[PDB]
Every structure is written in structure tokens, then in C-alpha cells.
Design a protein around this ligand. Structure first.
Ligand SMILES: [Zn+2]
Ligand SMILES: [Zn+2]
Ligand SMILES: [Zn+2]
Ligand SMILES: [Zn+2]
Lengths: 141, 689, 689, 141
């Protein structure tokens, strides 16, 4: 458990190792060190977050800790912002290819959200080199 | 002949259509063909052909041959007005430069008009042409810059004046305020962009020194929370994070640091009238978050003087402090921590250096992001609130303590008044990091300092190693000796036997022997290898004699100013002005910007007497008064006018000396019986400190 | 005859210039004199003369006499277009109404045109004329309203449609968004102002009941810090501080509360198309801080429907909560107090009423300004965070506990489903203040409630005493008995011997005897004093039988909503809709506004099955599902569409029932094997609560 | 000392009672209960603030307490705001006659500040019935 290459990174890949399914797996947060309920572990699987290991132990993140530390990182390491067309010109790679996550919930943006950003002319944000935007769930009033 | 079927213009045709028209006194064919070929953009692509396909000498010849009357000169401006929107939209949409590289050939044809400087071009032609030029692709800009770099110095100055006159006319002909801005003006933005092109052409046209580059500094490790977050996202360590650099800068491949002595001084490119009409509070926002139409001027820092660049840096630092305060408030709200939004620095008056060093070390090794908080220094033993008065006090005393020659930290040269790093400062690294962090926090908190360093120190701080040319400011005697050795035309193996085995004295007095090459005592200096001896001796002196100390000093300085745009805005020749202040004491400027409170009016009985007294003050008494009131004896960046002095009425005629609130440069002046009593009290008050 | 020298128009001249022109088939003199006299504003001041100097009947006669062809009608619109800017600037600058009161006489002449409703006036004439009318002085507006109040109901409806058609055309003919607004539009603002004038004319034209006004409520004492600050400034207590009232309201002297039954229903004045294009987030700001050009529409609340008035009230409450949070943060920063930005309400599930009562009492008697903070209810014995889910839970249980008939707090009438205040609730005042504060905090926090009260309760809450006409909703049997007594045409001293000595039953069953006058047993009811008996009996029943309890209830309710614009925006007939919710369950609207997350799409395999299942739900099953998910069984103010339901995918096909996150109306639906299994799980899940 | 009519209200009027001059009088704050220095007592005299008495004792306010509680009152009891011309029309009394104090330092506005508000079109604020504006000292950057 001391070689990172052997240790898995994704939630279902990790589940396959312990001979358990995502239905009734037990996981604990990395910041608050508390067990995740079913909702947050399923959200973790959906959001495609890599498992972090501390002293050779599996760890995930709960919704409160994730949404708090993402806000902290946004407030601290905000570099600048750019438009969708300008970002496309800078990277020359289609928007559906670049990995863009939500600022708050850290969920990767589906092409629908990127298109909505394009039409509504919302501004993509750069956070310590991590391009980001606003997802559908976090932009609902 | 009307010449109705001409599609391209060459040197002989534009020469043979001259004598016939002059003899037949009919200049109509000339003007009509000029308006035909020039207005059609595609015509200039092939006209006057041979990485340049245009014979510049032929263009100069035809331009001086045709610019000879009051009618031909009017045949160019209308053609330009008709052409410019077409070329602009063509470059914007059709991507013409992609299909051919010779489309750029028309730009040099247009810009070789020596009458472009004339005032008649500033109405409608030059703005549109500059818009078309600004709408040009990056590679074409790079090749145009490469072509322009071969021009002579007066030509580059001519282009610089050509664009600066347009900028001045456009800022004069219109008024701007908080409502209508200058960023949204398209013509001024285009003019600034072409001026940037010319400035980079000048930079790349001079000497380029890229080999003597300082080693890249180690980026400080963020807090463990951010590392855990990056691990969770799986991004981990990715090399996509760096300073914001100009796309033209990375396309050319040569930085402004490399240009030692440009053809035109950098201060010439600075535009004066634009600065007084430019607002930094909105320009910084337009620089950070992209706006659809507005163009921030901090993307071209050369056009800004030292007064407004300081404003931009201060705005960036203030925004960082505000974000840190927001983070502290969020911590206290959610997690439930004690609200600590200040960089608490509690030190003792006698041992400021050591207490500050240990506190800053324990902060940096634990919370590297804590240094970005607002400074709040509270001296031990005294109770009060530092609203901006104790921090400058702490800065002044820490400067005096660190720069004391007793510690041996810095050698002192009385012939120049410039401290230099002491190579003998062994086993003392924490203090150099301390002084670097002090300088960084000074830049961050907008507090000037009394620091005397040679320009080579700032050049090395910016990331360029010191060289032989920089030795004059640091070691004038050594520079004179080595330049005399270089300029000796005889045989250096016959008069002196100086070899690479070079010995120097020490602080105690006992000299030590140093070797430059492997065995310097066996290889003497000869005529052929004399050049490769001075550049190694000076390199050693400026780089590896202080290799250990200056590395720690630079690391400490960069720990605070890593995210600031200081590396992007300021050249090494402006860092000393940003940190220190102007030494010129102009109280006339202070007269205009002084404010009054407590009942005092501008035309008061005592205010005029006080102003007469301070104007009749001695050169040193002005410094003493400034140090007493504002906490420093140096003028702020800019002039005394930027120092918003406030004089507040205290009370009736008493025997108490006036007191100063250093946090706001506020002077408390009671209404004395007469002028002489006020002068006596001021003299007795400013001398205690 | 051309009639070139006419300066004023009277009934006979405008009649004698008709037969001659008709016989000579020349209508040019008519149109030319009409365009001459009407376009000149000063002419209408004296034309058609006799607090009104204009014979309205003659104006009607001439208007119906002249509106007979397709040419005369075109002679008025051009005259109006020429006149309106002149009258507008005249009233704006020259202050013409100050020098004479008969300048207003032209307004009625203009507005008596029965063809003003025709579509051709909406292009350029009516907007300018409405601008001129809106630019009129206050006293002239008051006298015009007094004149209009004498009109018949269909006339008032005609004026209302005349202005509403203009409003609808102006909002249809242009598009508005966050960029271009409707407030800055001058024509729509003027039309709304004249509509306000007409609405107040309608209000004052009906019955006015000012004598039966509730006693003014005692304004709560602010915190001791504000009292000390007021003492320091010397201002101390000022009676100037009061609610924001319409200047027209205080000029007329009659409030909208007095108008019981207006000539036209109040809902007619509500403009539908304006609301969907009107943004409250900017309108509230324009209402609070005055803007040079923008006009907030909350100054005329009648034009707003219940959906947008709720938005304005919510925005005001949210801004108050934000200011309270700012104050708490400032306290924690400067003074060093523990950051407590929430109204912590920790209660036990079994004894919610008593714990809430004691906590609210100790808060109100100590910190009256603490009630304005955001509610945060945390039940004792359970650990969690109330993001908006526990507060509504606490509201529902506190409503059930308080309105329990066991306590005897409120009498229950099954024939109407409307609880009434119990006069026998002696020595119980804290609970009435508790329920008043609960209602106030419910309005403040935007949480609907299941409360059944007669309209008389809300009328008394707003500040108007209950009367005989309001007895029907409260006591229909008593109302029927007293109206039968009133409608008896015979001698009431012969059939029944009912006197002012009136006895009523009690909750236990033993009746008690009450006296209305000094000695009601000695004075019987006669025919002449029958009218002054019912209005005293009903007055006693609705006012002084519950004099003690309702006073405490009103004080508790007003303690929270004293500074809110609720008293200014909502009539008593809308308070019950603001507090409670609509009882119509329209899932079709919920279909359109439902949002999906967790991987679910609109056209998903399980989403359609779920929608079919819920559409096939029974009337009571829909209520159960709504109560399970959103915490309440009632639709929000407006419709189900405003309830932004969210369905989130949970996980694979399991045996676990779906769970609901009540704070955000979020339903967690796993992907089941088929539709029938999902229906079974939903049925088993929504029935537990 | 229990009859308010006998007790003075202004600083120099109070000074005359105790046979002491404003030069060397001793006063203590009402909120923090700390002695005022010369600067704040002179500022109190200049700002025309009425002396408050607690249990028959003289009391003044220090700069920190005043500027803190004025900010609190502004954040709490802010009613609305109006323009200078609209305020003039509402009150029909000249601006130089109405008593307008600064929001922060509670200093009455001299006609110069009111004129500056008029030309610059700054907005007068209403705080619990107390009209207020921004003074010269508190609006300096
Ligand atoms: Zn956690
Ligand atoms: Zn999100
Ligand atoms: Zn105090
Ligand atoms: Zn002030």
C-alpha cells in the first residue's frame, strides 16, 4: 500500500479492489474525518474525483468540506478570468474537450453547461491554473 | 493617357507618369491612379515588389519624389480613409494573412509616408489605420517587429513620435471622467497597440543578453488544504501555472529584461497626458476580468509612468488583502476559529530584528498564505492601535537595525552611499530572508524605505545576473581598473603579471587568495584571453561571492511578491523608486494638496504664518519635519503632492507642543498667539525625534 | 367665413360653425379653428367656461356632436401632439398652476374625448399627454381626484381601461431585459402615475370609514446603544419618524384602508403584462435610494400582482437580514464578541410552544433588534444543520400545537373552517404574542403556513376595527340574525323583547349576561334606535370581547414587521394570501419548472414514469407528496411553478425508499427497475409522515 | 443633579458649572467608560454634541465609540435616501438651515459640504429620522 502505482484512484476501481460494490461501501472524509453517507459517496462517484490516500488509507471528501475548501481556493488563488471565445482561441481545443469543473461543487461541466456559458456570455475563471465555471446545480435560485 | 488598365505599381511606372504629367500640366492622371491603386487593398500586395518582398529604398525614393506639392499629399489621406475599414474587416474575418504572408507588405508601404507626422493625419486616417494595424495577426506582428529592429535610432524615434502625437491628440480632443472612459475608445487602444509594437521593436533592436539569466526561483508551497484539494481533483502538480506574459513577448522570444541599452530611452515611450486622464481602479479590473470592449492599459506597462504603476500595484495588493480578510471571516463563520484578519507582529523596541525574524520564520514555515494579510505591528510594552502609524515606525527601526555596519551584514562605501552585500557574512542566512521579507511587505503595504542599493542588486532580484557593465555602480574603482586593462593596446604579458589567481582583502584586514579557473596561478593574462578574464572576474564578484546570501535574500523577497504583477510592470530601474522615495523636497506641491480640519480654513490667520515658517525652513529642517509628521524623511513615489497632508486645529493658545497622527499624515496645530511663538513651538517639537 | 379672430370657444360658437360648414361642404374652417384653439394651451383656459369652472355636460355635448366623421377625429391628435410638450415644460418650469387654479380646466377638456380609447392615440398623443398630466402639481391632482370621484362606476372603468390599454401597448411594443429597463421609460411611468390618480379617485369615490380606526400601536423601543446615541446627538425622541406614505395619500386625507367596497374591484387595476417584464431586484433599490431618472413601481403597489409584491417584501427582508449579519461581523471584529449571525431557536420536539415562547420573550425583552436576524431552528436531541428545512418543520409543528382546540386558545367553527379568537382565554397573553411573532417571522423568512382566520382578523391587524359588515365571515348565523332584525319593517317592540341586555353561551356551557349600554335591561330595542344597536353589538363582539388577547397578538405581530413595507404594499385582503398559500394543486405548472441533477435528463426513462405516476395521483396523495417533499401541503404564493422543484438521481435500483431534502425542495430518486416498483416505493415513502 | 432642566447640555456650558476651562477638563466616555484625551474632548466641543448624564454624572463619547456606534446605527436603522433638490422640495427650508450631520463622525455639515453634495449630486441619507450626509474629513482618500 506504499506504491502509488498499485493503489487505485477512481471510486469504482477502488470498489473492485475491496470486493465491495458502490451500493454499500463505507468511506470517510479527508478533512473532517467523518464517514460519508450514501448521497455524498454517490455524488463523489458522479463528480469523478480521484481518491486521495493518507498513510496508505482510502479517503474521500464530503459535500461540506469540498464546497468550503473550493470556495477558499477560489477566494485565495484566483488568477484571472476569460471569455469562452477567447479561451477557445487561446487553447485552440474545442470546449467539449477541455476539463472544466464547477467553482463550488467541483463537478466537471457537461457540454450543456459550456454551451450555456457561451450563449449567456458568462466568464470562465482560472484558479491556480485550473480552469473553472459555474455548473447548473450551483447557479439555481 | 489616363492609365485606365494598371493593377500594380512599380518604380519605373510611378516615375514615367511624372514627366509627362508635368509637361502637360495635368496632375489629374497622377491623383486618379494613386486613388485607384491605393484604395484597393489587394493592389498593394503586388505593387512595388522585389522575409520582405518590398524594396524599402524604392519606397523611400518614390515617397520623396511624389511628396512635392499641395495636391499629391491630399491623394493619400482619402485613399487611406477608404482602405482602412476594408483592411480592418478583412483581417478580422477573412483571415487573409493565413492564405499568404505577403499581405503584410502593404503595411510598410503605408507607414513609410514621411508626412504621417503631419497634423492632417490625426483626424480620420491615422486612427483607422492604427485600428487596422492592431487587428493584425501575431506572426505578422513578430515579423514586422523583426524588420523594424533593423532601423536606425532616429527612425525608431520618428515612429515613436508618430504614434505619441496621435495619442496626445486623441486624449486632448476629448474629455474623460468616471462616466466616459479612455479604455473603451478604440482609436486610442489601437494607437497604444502600435506603440507597443514599436516599443518591442526597439527593445529587440538593441543588445540582447539571455545567457546571463538568474536561476528560476522555487515557487513557495501553498497550504496543506490546497495541496489536498489538488490531490482530490487529481490535477496534483501541473506545469500550466506561471506569470502573465505578453503573447508578443513569447512570440518574439526576447524579454524586456535582456535589452540593456535600447536605441531610444524607455522614458520616451511614457505618455504624459494619458496618465492624468487614466483611472487605475477600473483598468485593473479590466485587466483581471476580460471585458467585451474595454481594453486595460496595464497590458502595456511602458505607457504608464511610475505614479500610476504604483497605483495598479497598490490596488492589486489591496484586493489580495481584502480576499484574505474574506477568507478569515469565512473561517470564523463556518469552522468557528477566532477572527484574526491581521498579520500580528508583536516585537520589542530593543530586539525588533530577532523577534521579527523568529515570528516571520514561524509564519512562513507554517502558513505561507498568512504573509498576504494586512500588516499590524503592535510593540510590546505599549498599548495602542496601529491604524498605519506603527507599521512604518517598525519598518524604519528594522531598516536601521539591519543596515547597521556593526553586524557586518552589508559593506559600506562612503564614496557612493550604497551598501553592498558582505561576502563574509557566514552562518547568517535568516537575516537576509528577513530583510527580503521586509522589502516585500513594504512593497505590499505601501510604505517607503531608506535603502541604498546599487542597480545590480535590483537587476539580480528581477532575474538577471550581474555583469561587467553593472560593476561601475557597485565597485567604481574595480570598474575603472578593469576598463583600463581592457583599453590597453599593448602586450599585457610584459608590464603586469596579473593572472586568474586574484586576491582580495577582508573586513578584518587579512587578504585571501581566490582562483577563477582551475589553476589561475599558472595561466597568466594575455592579449587574446584578456576579454574572457574581466567577464569572469566581475561575474565571480557579482554572483558567486554572495551566492549563498543573495539566494536567501531573493527567496525571502519572492515569498511575498510571487503573485504580484511587480515582475510584469516594473523594470529593475524602477524597483528602487518603488521601494525608496524621491529625495526632492517640494513644499510648493504640498501647499496645493494640503487639507484642513477642526475649523481651520485655507485663508486663516495662523495657516499662512505656518506656511511661511515651513517655507523658510532649512534643507535639513524640512526633512526633520517630514520625518516627525509622516514618519519618513523621503517623498513618496511621485511627489509631495501625492502625500495628502492634513492640518487639524487642536485648541487654544497653550504651552503644549504640536502632535502628529502619523497614520494619516495629520498634524494637530493649536492656534498660538502669534507667528514667532508657533515657529518656536514647531522648532521645539520636530527636534525631539 | 374663416373665423380668423377667435380666442376662446363656447358652446354656441362651436355649434354655429357647424351648419354653415355642412351646407357649404367646407369642413376646412372647422379643422383649422380646432387646430388653432386647441394647440394653443392658454386658449383652453378660458374656452368653454361656466371648484370647477368647466361645464362638463356642454363638453360631452360638443364632443358627441363633433365626433361624427373621419376628418374631425384627426384634428384632435395633431393638436394634442403639438400641445403636450408645451404644457409639460410650462408646468415643469413656469409654475403656471401657482398663478391660477383654472389652468387645470384644460385637462378635463382633453380627457373627456370618448375616442381616447381608440388605438390611434397610443402612438404619440396619449404618452405625451400622460407625461404632461404626471408633471402636474399635487393640489391640482387632489382637486382632479375629487372631481373624478363623482363619476359613475362605468366612467371610472372607462378611464381605467384608457390608461391600461396604453400601458399594455407600451409594454408590448418594446422589449425589456436586465440591460434596458421599464422604469427608465418615461411614457410608461407617466401612464402609471395617471392610473394611480384614477385609482385613488376610485378609492375616495366609495364609502369612507375613518371613525372605526384601531388605536396606534406602540413602537418598540430600540436597543440601549441607539438610545444613548440619540441622547448624545440631543435629537432624543422624534415623532417625525413614520411609515413611508404617498404624498397624494396625505394630501387627499383618505387611506386605501377606509375604502371598503370601491366602485371598481381593486384587481382590475392590476396590470398583467407589466409584471412579467418587471424586475423587483432593481425596483426595490430605486424605491429605497432615489435615482435621477428611474422610477420605482413599488410606489404604486396597486399595479403589482401578489407574485411580485411578495418578491419586493422578500427582497426587503433579505436586505435587513444582510445588514444584521454585517452588524454581527462588525461586532465580532471590533468589540471581540462571538460571531452569532443567526436567531438560534433551540426547542424540544415535545414542548416546542413553551420553549419557543420563553426564548422569544427573553430575546424581545433584551434585544428587540435580534428578531431581525435570520432564523435558525435546531431541535434539541438531534444534530444537524438547518439550511431551510428545520425552520419550516418548526413552523408547522408550532402551528399545530398553538391551534389545538384542547388549549382553548381559538374557537373552531366547522361550518366555515375558520378559527376565531376565544374571549375566555384568561390569564394567557404570552401565547398570543408567541403566535403573532410566529406569523411575523413566517412573513420575514418566506415560509407559508396553514392558518385559517376570518378577514376581520387581518383587517384588525392592518389597523381597522371590525364592523357589522365583517361579521358575515366570522359569525354567519349572528350576521343573518341581525340582518333579519334590520330588514324587519314592523314594530320590534311588539314581536320580540330583545334589549341591549345580551347573553351569550360559554365554552363550558353556562351562559353569561353582558350589558352594551349603561342599563341594557331597562331600555328595549325600538324601531328608531334599531340601527344604533347592531353596530354596537357587532362592535363589542369583534373588538372588546377579545380586547386583551388581540392587543397582545397585534403587538407581537408588529414587533417583527414594524419596519417592513408590508403595511404599505398589502391590503388586508392579501395578507392571508401572503401568510398562507394557494390551495390549487396544479402539477402541470410544476412539470415545466422542475429541474434535474445527478445525471437525470428531461427525456429520461424513469422521469416520464415518475411524472405519469404523480399525475395519476389522488387529490389527497398530491398533498401528501408535497408535504413530504417541500415540508408543506399548500402551494406557495402564486403557483406550483414558483416552487423550483429539483429531482436528483441517487443511485442504482435498491430497496431504499426515496428521501427528500426539504431545504431546497430536492427529491432523491434512485433509478428503479420499472415504473410499478417506483410507484410502490413512492407510495410507501410519502405515507410515513 | 436629578432635575434635567438644571443640568447643562453643552460642553462649554458644562465647563462653566465646574469652575474649570475646556483647556484642562477631565471627561470620560459613556460606552467604553474611559477618559477622553485632549483631542477627542476638543473634537466633542467642535462637533456640538450634547452631554449625556447617567445617574447624575457627566459623560461624553470618544472617537472610537462614536464612529463605531454611528456605523452600527447606519447599518441598522437606515430608512432611505434622497437627493439635495428633492430634500429641499420636501422641506421647503434652505439646506443651510436644516441640521445635517456626518454619517461617521456625527459632525454637523457646514454649508461648504452641503454645497459640495449639491454639485457632486451625492445622496443625503435618512437614519431613523435623522438626516445625514458625508463630511469633508470622512470622505478623504
Ligand atoms: Zn468533510
Ligand atoms: Zn456546481
Ligand atoms: Zn468610548
Ligand atoms: Zn465625518
Amino acid at each position: 500500500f506504499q506504491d502509488p502505482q498499485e493503489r487505485p484512484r477512481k471510486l469504482p476501481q477502488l470498489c473492485t479492489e475491496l470486493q465491495t460494490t458502490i451500493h454499500d461501501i463505507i468511506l470517510e472524509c479527508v478533512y473532517c474525518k467523518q464517514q460519508l453517507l450514501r448521497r455524498e459517496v454517490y455524488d463523489f462517484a458522479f463528480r469523478d474525483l480521484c481518491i486521495v490516500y493518507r498513510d496508505g488509507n482510502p479517503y474521500a471528501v464530503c459535500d461540506k468540506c469540498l464546497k468550503f475548501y473550493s470556495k477558499i481556493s477560489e477566494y485565495r488563488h484566483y488568477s484571472y478570468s476569460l471569455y469562452g471565445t477567447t479561451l477557445e482561441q487561446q487553447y485552440n481545443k474545442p470546449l467539449s474537450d477541455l476539463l472544466i469543473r464547477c467553482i463550488n461543487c467541483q463537478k466537471p461541466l457537461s457540454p450543456e453547461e459550456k454551451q450555456r456559458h457561451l450563449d449567456k456570455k458568462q466568464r470562465f475563471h482560472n484558479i491556480r491554473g485550473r480552469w473553472t465555471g459555474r455548473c447548473m446545480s450551483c447557479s439555481r435560485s | 493617357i489616363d492609365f485606365k488598365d494598371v493593377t500594380y505599381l512599380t518604380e519605373e511606372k510611378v516615375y514615367e507618369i511624372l514627366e509627362l504629367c508635368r509637361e502637360r500640366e495635368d496632375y489629374s492622371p497622377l491623383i486618379r491612379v494613386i486613388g485607384r491603386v491605393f484604395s484597393s487593398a489587394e493592389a498593394l500586395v503586388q505593387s512595388f515588389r522585389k522575409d520582405v518582398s518590398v524594396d524599402i529604398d524604392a519606397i523611400r525614393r518614390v515617397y520623396t519624389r511624389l511628396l512635392s506639392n499641395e495636391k499629391i499629399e491630399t491623394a493619400f489621406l482619402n485613399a487611406l480613409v477608404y482602405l482602412s475599414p476594408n483592411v480592418e474587416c478583412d483581417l478580422t474575418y477573412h483571415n487573409v494573412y493565413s492564405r499568404d504572408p505577403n499581405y503584410l507588405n502593404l503595411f510598410i508601404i503605408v507607414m513609410e509616408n514621411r508626412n504621417l507626422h503631419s497634423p492632417e493625419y490625426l483626424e480620420m486616417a491615422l486612427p483607422l489605420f492604427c485600428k487596422a494595424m492592431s487587428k493584425l495577426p501575431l506572426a505578422a506582428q513578430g515579423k514586422l517587429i523583426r524588420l523594424w529592429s533593423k532601423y536606425n535610432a532616429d527612425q525608431i524615434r520618428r515612429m515613436m513620435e508618430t504614434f505619441q502625437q496621435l495619442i496626445t491628440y486623441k486624449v486632448i480632443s476629448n474629455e474623460f471622467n468616471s462616466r466616459n472612459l479612455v479604455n473603451d475608445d478604440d482609436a486610442i487602444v489601437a494607437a497604444s497597440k502600435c506603440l507597443k509594437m514599436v516599443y518591442y521593436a526597439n527593445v529587440v533592436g538593441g543588445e540582447v543578453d539571455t545567457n546571463h539569466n538568474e536561476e528560476d526561483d522555487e515557487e513557495p508551497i501553498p497550504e496543506s488544504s490546497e495541496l489536498t484539494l489538488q490531490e482530490l481533483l487529481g490535477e496534483e502538480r501541473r506545469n500550466k501555472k506561471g506569470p502573465r506574459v505578453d503573447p508578443l513577448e513569447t512570440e518574439l522570444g526576447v524579454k524586456t529584461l535582456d535589452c540593456r541599452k535600447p536605441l531610444i530611452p524607455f522614458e520616451e515611450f511614457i505618455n504624459e497626458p494619458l496618465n492624468e486622464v487614466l483611472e487605475m481602479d477600473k483598468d485593473y479590473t479590466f485587466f483581471k476580468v476580460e471585458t467585451e470592449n474595454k481594453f486595460s492599459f496595464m497590458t502595456c506597462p511602458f505607457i504608464l509612468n511610475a505614479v500610476t504603476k504604483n497605483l495598479g500595484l497598490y490596488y492589486d495588493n489591496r484586493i489580495r488583502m481584502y480576499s484574505e480578510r474574506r477568507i478569515t471571516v469565512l473561517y470564523s463563520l463556518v469552522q468557528g476559529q477566532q477572527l484574526n484578519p491581521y498579520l500580528r507582529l508583536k516585537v520589542r523596541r530593543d530586539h525588533i530584528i530577532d523577534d521579527a525574524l523568529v515570528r516571520l520564520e514561524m509564519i512562513a514555515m507554517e502558513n505561507p498564505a498568512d504573509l498576504k494579510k494586512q500588516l499590524y505591528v503592535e510593540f510590546e510594552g505599549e498599548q495602542g492601535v496601529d491604524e498605519g502609524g506603527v507599521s512604518k515606525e517598525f519598518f524604519q527601526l528594522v531598516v536601521e537595525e539591519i543596515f547597521n555596519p556593526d553586524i557586518g551584514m552589508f559593506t559600506y562605501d562612503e564614496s557612493t552611499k550604497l551598501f553592498w552585500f558582505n561576502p563574509s557574512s557566514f552562518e547568517t542566512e535568516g537575516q537576509f530572508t528577513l530583510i527580503g521579507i521586509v522589502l516585500g511587505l513594504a512593497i505590499y503595504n505601501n510604505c517607503i524605505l531608506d535603502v541604498h542599493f546599487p542597480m545590480v542588486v535590483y537587476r539580480k532580484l528581477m532575474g538577471k545576473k550581474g555583469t561587467f557593465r553593472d560593476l561601475g555602480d557597485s565597485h567604481p574603482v574595480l570598474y575603472q581598473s578593469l576598463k583600463d586593462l581592457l583599453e590597453y593596446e599593448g602586450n599585457v604579458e610584459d608590464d603586469m603579471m596579473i593572472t586568474f589567481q586574484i586576491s582580495q582583502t577582508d573586513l578584518f584586514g587579512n587578504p585571501m587568495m581566490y582562483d577563477l579557473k582551475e589553476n589561475g596561478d599558472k595561466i597568466p593574462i594575455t592579449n587574446e584571453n584578456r576579454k574572457e578574464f574581466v567577464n569572469l572576474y566581475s561575474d565571480y564578484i557579482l554572483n558567486k561571492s554572495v551566492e549563498k546570501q543573495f539566494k536567501a535574500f531573493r527567496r525571502g523577497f519572492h515569498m511575498v511578491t510571487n503573485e504580484s504583477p511587480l515582475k510584469y510592470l516594473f523594470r529593475p530601474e524602477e524597483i528602487e523608486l518603488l521601494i525608496c522615495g524621491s529625495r526632492n523636497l517640494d513644499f510648493q506641491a504640498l501647499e496645493e494638496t494640503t487639507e484642513y480640519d477642526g475649523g481651520y480654513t485655507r485663508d486663516s490667520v495662523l495657516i499662512r504664518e505656518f506656511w511661511e515658517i515651513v517655507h523658510s525652513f532649512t534643507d535639513e529642517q524640512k526633512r526633520l519635519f517630514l520625518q516627525f509628521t509622516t514618519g519618513t524623511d523621503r517623498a513618496p513615489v511621485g511627489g509631495l503632492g501625492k502625500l495628502k497632508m492634513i492640518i487639524a486645529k487642536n485648541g487654544p493658545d497653550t504651552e503644549r507642543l504640536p502632535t502628529s497622527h502619523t497614520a494619516f499624515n495629520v498634524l494637530l496645530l493649536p492656534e498660538y498667539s502669534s507667528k514667532e511663538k508657533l515657529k518656536e513651538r514647531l522648532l521645539k517639537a520636530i527636534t525631539y525625534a
